[PDB]
Symmetry: D2
Subunit: 345 residues, 4 copies
């Protein structure tokens, strides 16, 4: 089968031909219908060899949807042909976090060598993929696969980040979304669906500010040195109840600390090596919590799928073939994908 793989440190990924896998006991083989590209793939491919823990070669793609092609020995709960999304942050399934579906926060996965598809286990950027267990599949019914693939991370990750503090986001609240990319353009829409927060989008690119308004942001403002003042002009001196930073550069985290309200929240979702919030007296308002969330929970993925099925999420995509995979990653690097890139095998 055709697949897109990261094969050597510092190089671009390449299209390869590798055997179509066979599902062992408990496993499910999916025929992949859509595979999302994520900026985390770029972060992973830019890690030095000392840090990189994905293994070589690695089939990329941690945003996967498909149809059940083959059931491994003893697998029940799905039939051949069922359309399914892959729950990505695989955990042990047995610890206190996993028992609540919070496999993203599994305390045993490292020790047991459990790694996610697309970063240690083979991903969805291939014609077929193996899923380890039935509990890592969620039905999507007749959802269009191209718009469904991003739900698994571009949807799930912002959904989790927002869910952590949703009780803060009542009528009268403001939520700032920094970075209107794959994650951010879905995060705006989640905020509008599950809260009455006023949503203010922030991006470097004027076309992405237009995208923000298209998907329901109440205002959209230019990122950089003037952003904090511009957000404060919109909120008055109260600031923003919550800031969801999907960039996570030092400059954006600084903007976040300069606009967050007393008893508010900053979610540092975007990943930039070394960047961090500085949480201390006189550097941040009283009561303003900060976290780096990771991916999301099993029940959250089901909720994201439910939002998509109800028509609440308009996922902006561009479609690529497997052969165009490497080219698509270059597009993502240069910032020329409006929304989410999706490979269709």
């Amino acid at each position: 089968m055709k697949a897109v793989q990261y094969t050597e440190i510092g190089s671009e990924p390449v299209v390869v031909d590798i055997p179509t896998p066979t599902p062992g006991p408990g496993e499910i083989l999916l025929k992949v219908t859509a595979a999302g590209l994520c900026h985390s793939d770029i972060f992973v491919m830019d890690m030095p060899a000392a840090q990189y823990a994905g293994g070589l070669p690695l089939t990329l793609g941690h945003e996967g949807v498909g149809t059940v092609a083959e059931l491994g020995e003893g697998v029940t709960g799905f039939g051949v042909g069922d359309a399914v999304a892959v729950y990505g942050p695989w955990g042990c399934g047995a610890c206190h976090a996993c028992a609540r579906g919070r496999e993203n926060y599994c305390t045993r996965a490292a020790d047991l060598g459990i790694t996610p598809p697309g970063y240690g286990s083979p991903g969805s950027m291939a014609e077929y993929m193996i899923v380890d267990s039935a509990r890592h599949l969620v039905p999507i019914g007749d959802l269009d696969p191209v718009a469904a693939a991003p739900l698994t991370d571009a949807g799930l990750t912002p959904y989790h980040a927002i869910s952590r503090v949703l009780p803060l986001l009542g009528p009268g609240s403001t939520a700032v979304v920094i970075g209107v990319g794959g994650l951010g353009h879905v995060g705006i829409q989640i905020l509008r669906a599950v809260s009455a927060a006023r949503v203010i989008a922030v991006d470097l690119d004027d076309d992405r500010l237009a995208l923000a308004r298209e998907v329901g942001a109440d205002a959209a403002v230019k990122s950089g040195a003037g952003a904090a003042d511009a957000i404060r002009e919109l909120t008055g001196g109260q600031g923003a109840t919550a800031v969801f930073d999907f960039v996570g550069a030092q400059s954006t985290i600084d903007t976040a600390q300069q606009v967050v309200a007393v008893d508010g929240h900053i979610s540092v979702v975007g990943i930039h090596a070394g960047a961090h919030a500085k949480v201390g007296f006189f550097m941040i308002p009283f009561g303003a919590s900060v976290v780096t969330p990771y991916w999301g929970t099993r029940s959250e993925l089901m909720e994201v799928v439910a939002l998509a099925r109800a028509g609440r999420l308009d996922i902006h995509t561009e479609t690529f073939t497997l052969d165009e995979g490497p080219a698509a990653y270059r597009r993502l690097r240069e910032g020329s994908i409006r929304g989410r890139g999706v490979v269709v095998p």
Copy 2:
């Protein structure tokens, strides 16, 4: 009346003679029965003149209990002689935060010039004190005033900090308390009363580790370079669900980041100028939130008083006269008060 006041920048506080105040409309005059000394008073007195916002002169003391001496015009809900604790973090009473009793997070207090007793308004370290409004008094009944004074901050502040994340502290959880001083020795006892957390206390001083065990800590660890490893030996590689840092030095915040669990919490309660948690990917576990909480809420103070009335709080105190006020602050500076210092006028 006799009072203890901060009268010039960089100097020690002094005992003074100043007029006994008279309550205006809405105000209550208390005869003070006990006034707690807090390390925040030392922080305030060490601020350079540019930063210091308490006004000069300032009657110290933001931990106050007393008996109602005189009712100002139109005050109902209290009789002369009623024993009461003073709710300290005064707010506007009208904003969304204040309507929930969360006057510690009042968004209008700065703009309206509303300042707490002992830092902008006259404190409790005097024979009498004015309280601005009846909603800032909580009845204590027959509670001993000396042990009750610390409830207003040494009790309230840890109570608030713990309350922010109480749902995390289930059976099987661990809570670390760094700094077994006024706040910390009460925080251990709150944790034991309102959660099933295993409590690990951390202090530089072996006698304070003994105090920790006396008030119900399950374990005690010497602070400094070995603390993180020693806490991890006690928790296993999971780490501590929550860390309540009542020191807040860079070294203790670093220890906190090195031991906090995935999806855990660090509460940076203690104040050291410039110290901060560094909340960023690879610098803190996934999902581990961090906050600097401030004081507490009206309903929390009532709950703290209820804990004291139920016998759940053993407040360790040393008593001083008003004339001994300055000497007591020197004792607090040098770390020679075992628990909380309390002035009795």
Copy 3:
């Protein structure tokens, strides 16, 4: 001044001429700009003399907006001319519930003889009205008074009912609204603004089912014997996550028990003498909680006002003069007001 009063048991209310009141210390005199009629007024007027606790005569109206006309002695925080909504369920202000703004659940109001405007204290159906305290006023700015009056109860009560279980109403959930009257037509809109619940409205009257669709209900079902089956056809055998019963007749409560989901909720908001849910094994699903909520909290009223200011609430009204007050109550009795009746003095 002109007012509408209930003056004898079993009779219709009458237009009267009574002195314009003068505000005592702490009180505020409002010039009333709009006064809502509520079906609770009919319930109150139909009570036998043994049960009725409103006093005679009673100025009706517990849904009041106005402009500040006169400040009583010592009142600050409002200026003459300020547009304000009246928080109705007056409490003592000092107990644990009141400290959290939850004066609807005040434990001391009965003992202290504190009664709400329109049921023990004089209501808003008059040219002027007294409010006991500044904390019972919430600013509305330039909101149209006619559409703002209903926010104080038709908005607040459903808002509170929904808020009690809002975490249940995630994507994929269903909320049933029984009774599309004053409260119910606002409840549909709150559900749409603060949750991703699919909303199914239930009413006896086809025109009210049309109103339900006009304000955003996803589906509409005829009430009565077929309603349970019709709701289940829409939800599948899972049933409805939450049922907000704004009728509260035995028949509607029975419908609610027949459609509620496992681990769901029934809020019995509407009042019919003797009607009750029967909460016991085999009579209701496992985990499905039931409550009779009362009015709402101070912070909730602020949130409702915030929803109105953001354009999320389209309040359907019909306007009446004070002279038409009694006629308007007859209209409400017969079910001929489409939404909320509002008296404008």
Copy 4:
């Protein structure tokens, strides 16, 4: 193997000899070390034939602990000899409730024919038992099995009931526990461990009031017509923040409605056919919620085990052999077991 079974409608359970089962793919065979008796077993055995859905014959026992004896095909995550408690309210594992561990509230179990051990599937009152899946086992380490068996229901059910409203139970709150039996005597102890609530116990039997005080109740009062006034004398006119009714008779539910506070809670945990709270205006205070909870969640069982491991739960038991199973059920019927009855297969 020896087992205790319900074999015909209206009859007492009997000791039988039936084959030792073999685990199929995904299943685990446990050697049972302790099996708790629960009053729900009596409720089930008293159902008329039209209502009874447990199947015949039925090996009783939904409170089970054991050691892993045999792993079915493909089972990982447990070794032979591991000491484990059985999570009882089996669900589909795939629905929104099950994904959160809330298999007690599974929306698909009925449709798929998934039934719990001891009520549709074979229970733990036997020398061996099959568990359907590894996710229904929780490790207990070196916990004494006799005191551990009750954690699976006598612990889990009150724990769940309390957990639903734990944020209400702050300092200053009062929690009433009606019925100091298997569930109730553990519920008192959970309340003391996870909240600062003042605990008031209620029972018909003075010896059970003594038991209540022994395990940390702040007060213990006689059930029946005078109980509501006696509880109100202890709380003042505020009433009780929460009432956990582990009897669930109409009389106890009525007591609960008469003492619950405004914005409080009544958890109707005990099962009496036809009994119900009447939730309506003027019949209950404003804001006082009422629910019938069912069993508990996966993460809750882990928390209960953690409480036991920390020394927070003193489980009062009496031990019986498998041969004494039927006699033990008669003891439970007559109210003569002080705490929980536990069968230890030899």
